[PDB]
């Protein structure tokens, strides 16, 4: 009669590493490193993302003609841009504090596209119809941004603007505008009166005076001039004012928004599909709960810590050594 | 005759966790996590903090009329602000590089209020008695900042201002000033009989020209204009020159200071007491030698690292089981 | 022992045996479950103690903010190097600790048998016992359970030790 003291073995081929020995085969192991993903972009925290497709963020927030078909959700957890994201701005220029604006419109708890200054009421003394350019035609028609309008002289007259907005909404309001920089003085006079123009924009916290910078620029698109873009947040109950005698591009639409916990922007060509996850990566949604992954490290959400290892496995069995 | 070997047990109630077992009983344990504090703010590294009580950094360093009751410390380790520290830039405007000023002033080994431009002799061609406003009156009467003088026209004229200072101190001198931005051109003409005006300030490192931006802003504290604030550090042996034709708010006092690279700014309503500590948190001074704390993520001085753990008792004793 | 048992249907540890009533692996279910509970607590401590927070990794910077972009990259690379080194080192150390734990568990069952049999069996040297007693299924079941009435069996063990 024999009594043998030993341990279980199986046909498992999963191995683990130790400080004293590598490639140790074990009967069971638990993988701490996720190397698989959904391959799809999905909802984060139960809320769908805002997918811009071919449009850039500047394009969407400015209402670029190529973004007319892009429906805006009342809320989103993050923004998705494609690898060919283009048609952001059209009249070329420097979008001021663009990265900060992209950071602010990351995760938004509420987002309503609100009309701040109706086209046919707010500017009875200026022409809101001829403000178009060939930089962004719509079906070749020479169009312009949908959220902003470019005012020009009516009858060789450009009276001073004193339009303001009282922000009677209960949420912060994002107001966008820009400054036009004609190629030469002749274009400043052709487009606007009061060639020695100025623009003033401000709120209780923010105020700044702008001047046109008239000079011939390198050609971009087909117009040797520039359009600088600005934005500001208006606190609930605060008043935002716009004053100008010349090169002011005024908002027509503005966005009333309540911001959520900080999120970010995913650059990816992967299509968007319906799923429910807690962290979304540009390469695809992560479905795991493990502490580490080897998936591309600019993820958004409650994601595990990126590790460059090809495998992380903890042993939970015994040496699988038959004999 | 029987002898036995065993191990110590006692009436201990302190428990520990392990990777293999949870809630084990230990005869004695050393708590590595500090969860207690004095509940009072105290001296850091043997030097008392500057306690502002009610004042903001802008208020104290500019000399807000409601901030005159604070003492002037020769040195401080850190600065304490209350949650009600709204007494700051009483005349609305953009304080330029305000966060940098707060960082620079967070820890000073030697600090003195020095009169840089004597009130009765430095501006014989300008009116230094007016310039009091309703934005921050004192005892119901119009007043202005203690450390700044808002110069206005002597009477139907604003003579050219050109005043330099040579830094004869052995320490760096912090010089503050501001620029006034009237609401309308009538306000500019009333205060400064110069119409278009400019301000120039410079040192051996700093050189900048300012131009008034006249425009109507939203009304804040009954004011329609704005006053921007500027500052610079003059190295010993250098000089600062203030050249202006109007819209310049000139210093009266400047601060001689020897800067450290230590503490930060604590915003807390905790009272100040006398203690010998090395670490200060908004909730109170910490007296501990332990490697970890769960008291507050915002820490000043040579303190343990903040963790989210609620229990890190080290099982320094023996397993305590009855028999 | 020479190696593990590929013919055992369950458990991690056991008492493979052969006697006049047959043979089998007789898995040790109580010590296996105790090992399972402690290893389960270990893996859950490694996984669940990661206090992953909701945060966004990656920031957009302009062409005149290169030092900040390099600071962000420095932070991401430093955290990646710390988490890669600590995660990989933790895996190797924890696996050495886990396999040493399991080997000590087999040693613990062997030691249990040694204390229970009290020289009523001899050691072969590869983790096995050769019984002096003709040890039937009830005998072995009692040994597996941890109960062994040494003084009634010791008379036969003594005679068999005299015989060798």
């Amino acid at each position, epitope marked *: 009669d024999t009594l043998c003291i030993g341990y279980h073995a199986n046909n498992s081929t999963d191995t683990v590493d130790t400080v004293l020995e590598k490639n140790v085969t074990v009967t069971h192991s*638990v993988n701490l490193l996720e190397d698989k993903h959904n391959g799809k972009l999905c909802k984060l925290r139960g809320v769908a993302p805002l997918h811009l497709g071919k449009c850039n963020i500047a394009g969407w927030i400015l209402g670029n003609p190529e973004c007319e078909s892009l429906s805006t959700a009342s809320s989103w957890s993050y923004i998705v841009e494609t690898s060919n994201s283009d048609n952001g701005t059209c009249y070329p220029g420097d979008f001021i504090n663009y990265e900060e604006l992209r950071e602010q419109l990351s995760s938004v708890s509420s987002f309503e596209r609100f009309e701040i200054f109706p086209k046919t009421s707010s500017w009875p003394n200026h022409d809101s119809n001829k403000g178009v350019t060939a930089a962004c035609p719509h079906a070749g028609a020479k169009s312009f941004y949908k959220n902003l309008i470019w005012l020009v002289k009516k009858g060789n007259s450009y009276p001073k603007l004193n339009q303001s907005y009282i922000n009677d909404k209960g949420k912060e309001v994002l107001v966008l505008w820009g400054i036009h920089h004609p190629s030469t003085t002749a274009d400043q006079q052709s487009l606007y009166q009061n060639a020695d123009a100025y623009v003033f924009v401000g709120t209780s916290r923010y105020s700044k005076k702008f001047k046109p910078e008239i000079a011939t620029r390198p050609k971009v698109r087909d117009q040797e001039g520039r359009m600088n873009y600005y934005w500001t947040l208006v606190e609930p109950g605060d008043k935002i004012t716009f004053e100008a005698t010349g090169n002011l591009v005024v908002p027509r639409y503005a966005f009333t928004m309540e911001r959520n916990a900080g999120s970010g922007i995913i650059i990816s060509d992967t299509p968007v599909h319906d799923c429910n996850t807690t962290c979304q990566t540009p390469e695809g949604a992560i479905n795991t709960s493990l502490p580490f992954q080897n998936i591309h490290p600019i993820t958004i959400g409650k994601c595990p810590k990126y590790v460059k290892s090809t495998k992380l496995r903890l042993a939970t069995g015994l040496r699988n050594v038959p004999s | 005759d029987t002898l036995c070997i065993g191990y110590h047990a006692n009436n201990s109630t302190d428990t520990v966790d392990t990777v293999l077992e*949870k809630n084990v009983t230990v005869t004695h344990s050393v708590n590595l996590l500090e969860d207690k504090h004095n509940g009072k703010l105290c001296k850091l590294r043997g030097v008392a903090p500057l306690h502002l009580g009610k004042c903001n950094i802008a208020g104290w360093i500019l000399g807000n009329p409601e901030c005159e009751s604070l003492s002037t410390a020769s040195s401080w380790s850190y600065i304490v602000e209350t949650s009600n520290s709204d007494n700051g830039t009483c005349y609305p405007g953009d304080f330029i590089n305000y966060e940098e000023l707060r960082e620079q002033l967070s820890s000073v080994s030697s600090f003195e209020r020095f009169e840089i431009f004597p009130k009765t002799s430095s501006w014989p061609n300008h009116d230094s008695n007016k310039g009091v406003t309703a934005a921050c009156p004192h005892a119901g009467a119009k007043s202005f900042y203690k450390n700044l003088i808002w110069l206005v026209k002597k009477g139907n004229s604003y003579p050219k201002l050109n005043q330099s200072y040579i830094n004869d101190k052995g320490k760096e001198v912090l010089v503050l000033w501001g620029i006034h931005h009237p609401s309308t051109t009538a306000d500019q003409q009333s205060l400064y009989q110069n119409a278009d005006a400019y301000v120039f300030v410079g040192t051996s490192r700093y050189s900048k020209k300012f131009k008034p931006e006249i425009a109507t802003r939203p009304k804040v504290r009954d004011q329609e204009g704005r006053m921007n604030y500027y500052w610079t550090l003059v190295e010993p042996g250098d000089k600062i020159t203030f050249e202006a034709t109007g819209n310049l708010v000139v210093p009266r006092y400047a601060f001689t200071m020897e800067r450290n690279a230590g503490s930060g700014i604590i915003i807390s309503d905790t009272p100040v007491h006398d203690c010998n500590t090395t670490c200060q948190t908004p909730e109170g001074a910490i007296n501990t030698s332990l490697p970890f704390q769960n008291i507050h993520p915002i820490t000043i001085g040579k303190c343990p690292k903040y963790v989210k753990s*609620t229990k890190l008792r080290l099982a320094t004793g023996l397993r305590n089981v009855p028999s | 022992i020479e190696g593990g048992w590929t013919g055992m249907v369950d458990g991690w540890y056991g008492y493979h045996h052969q006697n006049e009533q047959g043979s089998g692996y007789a898995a040790d*279910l*109580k010590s296996t*479950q105790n090992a*399972i509970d402690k290893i*389960t607590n270990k*893996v859950n401590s490694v996984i*669940e103690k990661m206090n992953t927070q909701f945060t966004a990794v990656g920031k957009e910077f302009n062409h005149l903010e290169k030092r900040i972009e390099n600071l962000n990259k420095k932070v991401d690379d430093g955290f990646l190097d710390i988490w890669t080194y600590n995660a990989e080192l933790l895996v190797l150390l924890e696996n050495e600790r886990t396999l040493d734990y399991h080997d000590s568990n087999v040693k613990n069952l062997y030691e249990k048998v040694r204390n229970q049999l009290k020289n009523n069996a001899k050691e072969i040297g590869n983790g096995c016992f050769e019984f002096y007693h003709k040890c039937d299924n009830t005998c072995m079941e009692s040994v597996k359970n941890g109960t062994y009435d040494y003084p009634k069996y010791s008379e036969e063990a003594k005679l068999n030790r005299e015989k060798i």
Partner: antibody
Amino acid sequence: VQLVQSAPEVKRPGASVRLSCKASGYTFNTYGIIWVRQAPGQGLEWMGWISAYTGNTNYAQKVQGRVTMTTDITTSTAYLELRGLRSDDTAVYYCARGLLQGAVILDSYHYALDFWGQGTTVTVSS
Amino acid sequence: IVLTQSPGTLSLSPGERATLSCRASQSVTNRFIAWYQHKPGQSPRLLIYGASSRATGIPDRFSGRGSGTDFTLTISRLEPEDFAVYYCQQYDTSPRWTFGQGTKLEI
């Protein structure tokens, strides 16, 4: 899936009772059986625990000494015994599946109870 | 083990949404909280395990989340079949389970 309980038992105050529950589509040796008492003022009271692997049990702290349990693979039943009862112990005594008991638990499903039984009642009111 | 169901009674019509808050005295890991439904006349059925995971075979109408000492069960629509009683379950490392008392559900 769906454990089997049948034949309600009615006895007398001050006398022992026996309860049973049979496994459905399982191997029996990968889980335990836990009982929950349903009564007008208790709601759900965790009574009993067993593991069909080790034979170990945590009874219940306030009832130790009044309940005995042992497994029997041959007929697949919990085979509960209850003795020294009064009359306040009348309850449904639902049967449920407990811990995995045999593999590392990486899924919270193996702590939560599921696949409750049919709820055969016991009445001791005579 | 202390489990408290705060609202006591929830009386809401079908088509609305409601929550049940279960407070624990001891902070525990999320792995040990489960939510159950008890329709009178039948046996309890599992709704949620691990404080968030969906039970096998249940519609998306039932959800929940929680942490620390405060866990919430969220019921959407509140169909006639939902007006029963809910129990909060807690496990604490050792093989010890408890249930709460639940709340009354009324139209």
